[PDB]
Amino acid sequence: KTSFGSLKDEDRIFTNLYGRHDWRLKGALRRGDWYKTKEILLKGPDWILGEMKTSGLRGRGGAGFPTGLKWSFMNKPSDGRPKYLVVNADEGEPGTCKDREIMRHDPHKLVEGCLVGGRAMGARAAYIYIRGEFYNEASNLQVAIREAYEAGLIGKNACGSDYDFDVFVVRGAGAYICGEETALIESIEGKQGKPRLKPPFPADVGVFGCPTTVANVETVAVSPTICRRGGTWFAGFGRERNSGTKLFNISGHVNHPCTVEEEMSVPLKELIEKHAGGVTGGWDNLLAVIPGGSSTPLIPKSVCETVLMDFDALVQAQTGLGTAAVIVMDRSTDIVKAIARLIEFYKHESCGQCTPCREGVDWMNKVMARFVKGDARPAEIDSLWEISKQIEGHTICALGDGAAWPVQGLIRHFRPELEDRMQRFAQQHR
């Protein structure tokens, strides 16, 4: 295919995204979850990993790394240590609510995916690290897990497949950095949410020093549907190497901010004008879009005309597809203030372990506040660009990169706005 989008309801995976049906076990079984999962587990690890590989699913976390290869990293004989699946349910990133929606509305999809991924990698348990603020979502998840345990889908006979699997839910305590892979592992282990360096990779030394795999809720939840309907179908959706469906959270200055499920490689204009009701004031009133949550840079209207929603398409557009969180800003937006608020978010959410992110993100927050006030001179724009380049790639984890990229996008596109603010401040003071 050449044009992508217009995903059909019979092809949408998260059929209870809007909470209009029963989220409990009876409604999930009516919607088709837990179907032939015993047959899937008896087909076993290699078949499931091959299904994920031929589906070509990439990480919904925002990393974009292939799921089949990442899960086949744990397809090894055991050395006496237990093995663990860990489910990133924190959803800290701004603009993003898709994991919250599918946890509170399709929790049995998440439980079945935990079982399927744990069987595929070889695992005795899945620890779902949920965000600490999602108390009601966590309680709904525990209700679904109790239903699964009572129905025998989980625990000591996984749907009667002679496989033992446990699903635990562990709540966080309010840290965006605990959504990171290794920092999440440390938070489960009970220390501070500080990411650890790689190597060792979590497939070798992870939670409790055991081989483990951290996977996003959307990835885990689409795993059993991929196994049931085949990887060829999921690969048939989307473009080449950007395959399947995706949950987009369109927020900001749109008429209908919403979470929707749409095919990969949908045009951004098509997605907004179809599901968000368009920009407030119109497509001409559109100014900028942050397409992949706060960690991705912004793109102006001119390139937002024709851009697709692929990893590769946004990389060509000098962006990324992060959590598919499309934040829309119109002509009335104080764009410098919005980007400075994002940098203040990263300043408050840095874990402070490593020097470039700690000191530099605090520095960039101060510089961006002065940029909002206009209290700088245009040489500081290139100074801030160089500071962002010093932060990016020099940190333990990718919070430094996710703080450097919005600054780079703002400098790359809206530089005359910054210079105009500095000039207006200079002429109004002197």
Ligand X SMILES: Cc1cc2nc3c(=O)[nH]c(=O)nc-3n(C[C@H](O)[C@H](O)[C@H](O)COP(=O)(O)O)c2cc1C
Considering only residues 312 through 371, tell me which ones interact with ligand X, judged by CB under 6 A: none
179 is in an annotated binding site: yes
Applying CB under 8 A, the site for other proteins has a residue count of: 149
User: Could you say which DSSP state residue 197 is in?
Assistant: P
| 181: contact with ligand X by CB under 6 A | yes
177 is in an annotated binding site: yes
Alpha helix segments (H runs only) across 325-354: 335-349
185 is in an annotated binding site: yes
Give the helix/strand (H/E) hosting 299.
strand 299-300
| 354: contact with other proteins by CB under 8 A | yes
| 351: contact with ligand SF4 by CB under 6 A | yes
Give the helix/strand (H/E) hosting 105.
helix 98-105
Q: From residue 151, how far is each of 108, 113, 384 by CA, in Å? A: 12, 16, 57
Q: How far is the CB of 130 from ligand X (least distance, A)?
A: 10
Tokens of 33: 């979850």
Positive or negative CA dihedral for 351, 322, 325, 288? positive
- The neighbour count for residue 362, using CB atoms within 10 Å, is 15
Q: From residue 381, how far is each of 199, 341, 406, 410, 411 by CA, in Å? A: 36, 17, 13, 10, 7
Tokens of 317: 């557009």
Q: How far is the CB of 40 from other proteins (least distance, A)?
A: 7
- Residues 253 to 272: which contact other proteins by CB under 8 A? 253, 255-262
Q: How far is the CB of 257 from other proteins (least distance, A)?
A: 4
For ligand SF4, the closer CB: 313 or 351: 351
| 70: contact with ligand X by CB under 6 A | yes
Distance CA 279, CA 277 (A): 7
Q: Fill in the amino acid letter for 350.
A: S
| 166: contact with other proteins by CB under 8 A | yes
User: Could you say which DSSP state residue 167 is in?
Assistant: E
Are the C-beta atoms of residues 275 and 248 closer than 8 Å to each other?
Answer: yes
- Of 54-62, 267-275, 308-316, 346-354, the window that binds ligand SF4 (rule: CB under 6 A) is 346-354
Judged by CB under 8 A, the residue of 123, 276, 324, 368 near other proteins is 276
Judged by CB under 6 A, the residue of 55, 243, 353, 388 near ligand SF4 is 353
- Residues 386 to 405: which contact ligand SF4 by CB under 6 A? 395-397, 399-400
Kind of pairing between the strands at 125-130 and 166-171: parallel
- Residues 81 to 110: which contact ligand X by CB under 6 A? 88, 90-93
- Residues 171 to 230: which contact ligand SF4 by CB under 6 A? 177, 194-195
Binding mask 125-144 for other proteins (x = CB under 8 A): x-----xxxxxxxxxx-xx-
Map residue 250 onto helix, strand or coil. strand
113 is in an annotated binding site: no
190 is in an annotated binding site: yes
Distance CA 82, CA 231 (A): 29
Binding mask 401-420 for ligand X (x = CB under 6 A): -x------------------
Tokens of 320: 């990324």
387 is in an annotated binding site: no
**For residue 363, what are the contacts with CB-CB under 8 A and spacing of at least 6?**
387
For ligand X, the closer CB: 129 or 414: 129
Kind of pairing between the strands at 238-239 and 242-243: antiparallel
Kind of pairing between the strands at 325-330 and 245-252: parallel
- Residues 398 to 427: which contact other proteins by CB under 8 A? none
Q: How far is the CB of 87 from ligand SF4 (least distance, A)?
A: 21
Positions at the binding site for NADH: 59-68
Positions at the binding site: 59-68, 171-219, 351, 354, 357, 397
Q: What is the binding site for ligand SF4 (CB under 6 A)?
A: 177, 194-195, 350-354, 357-358, 395-397, 399-400
